[PDB]
Amino acid sequence: LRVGLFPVRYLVGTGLPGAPQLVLDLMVDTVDHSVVGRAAVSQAVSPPLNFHADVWGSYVFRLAIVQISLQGNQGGPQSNSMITFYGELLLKGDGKTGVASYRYYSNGSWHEVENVPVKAD
Known part of the structure; x- marks a missing residue:
């Protein structure tokens, strides 16, 4: 409701099959x-x-x-x-590309994905 907000969508991953x-x-x-x-x-x-x-x-x-x-x-x-997700995005300053790591909880265990590409849109 205040001025200063914008949306953005990030696709995080190598994109490999x-x-x-x-x-x-x-x-x-x-x-x-x-x-x-x-x-x-x-x-x-x-x-x-x-x-x-x-x-x-x-x-x-x-x-x-x-x-x-x-x-x-x-x-x-x-x-x-309980927290089931942690993420760290290191985007280039334009906010449109970069690298990211994350961890998510599933089936009683944590799964980590490290240093994968990031793109907006």
Whole structure:
């Protein structure tokens, strides 16, 4: 409801057959430097991976990287559900490309995807 917000969609992954794919639909508040949105992790493997989380975090600019830290769960930050997602995006300063790592919880275990490409749109 305040002026300072914009959306952005990031596709995180190598894009290789059978590789994990993370889609982040993010809201960015350029005043408080805060971020909120959704994470979806899928993989065209057998069985199908359909992981989802409400995510939140913040961004920081260092001179040129824009670093976005995210964590997530079922419901968001006011929910007391366990954190099931952590992500760190190291985007180039234009906010359109970069590298990312993340960890997600599924089937009683953590799964980590490290240093994969990031693109917007």
